[PDB]
Design a protein around this ligand. Sequence first.
Ligand code: SIA
Ligand code: CA
Lengths: 182, 120
Amino acid sequence: RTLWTTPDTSPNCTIAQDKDSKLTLVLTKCGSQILANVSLIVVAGKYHIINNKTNPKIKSFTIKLLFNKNGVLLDNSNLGKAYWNFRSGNSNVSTAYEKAIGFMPNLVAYPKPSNSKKYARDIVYGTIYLGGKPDQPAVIKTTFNQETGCEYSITFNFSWSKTYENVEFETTSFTFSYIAQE
Amino acid sequence: SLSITTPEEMIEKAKGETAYLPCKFTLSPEDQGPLDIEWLISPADNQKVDQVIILYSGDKIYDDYYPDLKGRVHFTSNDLKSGDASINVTNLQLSDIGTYQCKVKKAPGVANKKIHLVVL
Ligand SMILES: CC(=O)N[C@H]1[C@H]([C@H](O)[C@H](O)CO)O[C@@](O)(C(=O)O)C[C@@H]1O
Ligand SMILES: [Ca+2]
């Protein structure tokens, strides 16, 4: 099964201001591994058009998905709940899901912060490209179970090093996987 | 240069809960001066200047500032100097709604972040 944002979401993400972005995230369960595909289109606000000549210190921002013990997305996540659900065709089933523990990042594989520093294996790095241009790389850093105030979390950090001038923040797609809770 | 992750951020949390206000920073090699962290709030009274909340300065925490937050605000990291100036605010009230600012300095490096906090 597939748990997703749908493939053409309306704004569903709030980073700097309400509904300023479109996170596309598709999670497909392959037994104990989740196959994940992600991209971002920023549609308004601080991160919409990058200009590091005028704003040299805008270099990194983060989106958090926080889940409860049932794998249900929490309200205070950056991603909104309305169109995060099990798929039906190119959309979602009509009723909000109640259980998705099989899609959660495994807590033994990726423990919450403790007296132990999290190992680097709890992170996956990828490079995506703004506007699909090969000379406009940005880094997507994905961390499992970093966050407080939840049972499970997936954190997406987007960052870049180049001085971009009037570059719209809309990315190519990246595939990764992670170990499922069950 | 010195920068902070998500330098403008919106955060929502429910009344009675604990807000986590992130201020994760990255230094440049030139930033060899003393680390200085300052958090401020803009009062709901728009005619009142910003008020200090909490400081980290000379490897010490100073928190005898904004009375409405006294006792409810703490730095969260066990190793702030490694790049984590985040704070939490306990037992959120509707009156905690507002814009919070984190200022990170390590001379000559400087950066700032603003958080719009909403309490439901
Ligand atoms: C898709 C890809 O691999 N892009 C890479 C590009 C291209 O190879 C060249 O721009 C084409 O000439 O080179 C970089 O140094 C750059 O421009 O920042 C790194 C970037 O990751
Ligand atoms: Ca004001």
